[PDB]
Amino acid sequence: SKFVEWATTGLPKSTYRLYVVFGFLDAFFGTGYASYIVDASVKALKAVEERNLWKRVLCTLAKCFEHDQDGFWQAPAHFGAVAPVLVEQFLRNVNDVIQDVVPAVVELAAAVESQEHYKEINTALLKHLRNGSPGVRLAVVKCQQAITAKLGEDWLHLLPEMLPYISELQDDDDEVVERENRRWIVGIEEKLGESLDSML
């Protein structure tokens, strides 16, 4: 309780905040604790510029996904606040944060499975699917992939956009995304099956 108050005081009236403080919170982060942590995690996401601070928090959400899973409340309780903070981040901010954001969606999806951000996220992914370096591309491919696994649930409509996203990439001639794009294609095969027709 006391720790939170000091950090809040640090804000632009007077940085310690995102960089060092957030890093510290990340360390403490690394389920019982989740209720207590929530506000602080929220602050980290909010302080976009303490970009580094934001990156660390976004990264923490991902780590929370793997540890908590469904408990993480990606499907559950915790997700609802986090997803809108994340969504807002995109809406309003260093460009570098966004890619990390897009992959986190994937980790969130893996955990939650069934919970309904899908329309907004997939659409967001579509716009992003358009460029921002390969950094964004790798991130977008990653977000589709955990979404696909995570569900083991819907996404079929999108497959034709995604492969065509991959197709454009094919002409581009530049690498890290290749691994991610390959990973997605394999994932599609498992879920969809018939996606070969689109590939051919």
Partner 1 sequence: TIVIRTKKILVNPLLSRRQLSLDVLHPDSPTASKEKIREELAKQLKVDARNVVVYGFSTQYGGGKSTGFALVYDNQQYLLKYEPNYRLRKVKILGEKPNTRRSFKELKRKIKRTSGKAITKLLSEKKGDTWASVQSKKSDHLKNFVAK
C-beta of residue 97 within 8 angstroms of C-beta of residue 91: no
The two structure tokens encoding residue 71: 């408990």
Nearer to partner 1, 4 or 199 (CB): 199
C-beta of residue 142 within 8 angstroms of C-beta of residue 102: yes
Nearer to partner 1, 116 or 197 (CB): 197
Is residue 190 within the footprint of partner 1 (CB under 8 A)?
yes
* Nearest-approach distance from CB 143 to partner 1, in angstroms: 19
Nearer to partner 1, 81 or 192 (CB): 192
* Nearest-approach distance from CB 158 to partner 1, in angstroms: 14
Closest of 114, 139, 119 to residue 129, by C-alpha: 139
C-beta of residue 199 within 8 angstroms of C-beta of residue 185: yes
C-beta of residue 31 within 8 angstroms of C-beta of residue 68: yes
Is residue 197 within the footprint of partner 1 (CB under 8 A)?
yes
Q: For the window 148-187, what string marks contact with partner 1 as x by the rule CB under 8 A?
A: -------------------------------------xx-
C-beta of residue 140 within 8 angstroms of C-beta of residue 165: yes
Nearer to partner 1, 91 or 200 (CB): 200
The two structure tokens encoding residue 67: 């540890």
CA distance 165 to 161: 6
Rounded alpha-carbon distances, angstroms, from residue 147 to 7, 71, 114, 116, 118 = 35, 17, 10, 12, 9
Is residue 89 within the footprint of partner 1 (CB under 8 A)?
no
Rounded alpha-carbon distances, angstroms, from residue 195 to 16, 41, 149, 189 = 50, 39, 15, 6
Is residue 32 within the footprint of partner 1 (CB under 8 A)?
no
Interface size with partner 1, residues (CB under 8 A) = 14
* Nearest-approach distance from CB 64 to partner 1, in angstroms: 31
* Nearest-approach distance from CB 184 to partner 1, in angstroms: 10
Among 52, 69, 93, 198, binds partner 1 (CB under 8 A): 198
* Nearest-approach distance from CB 176 to partner 1, in angstroms: 20
Per CB under 8 A, residues contacting partner 1 are: 185-186, 188-190, 192-200
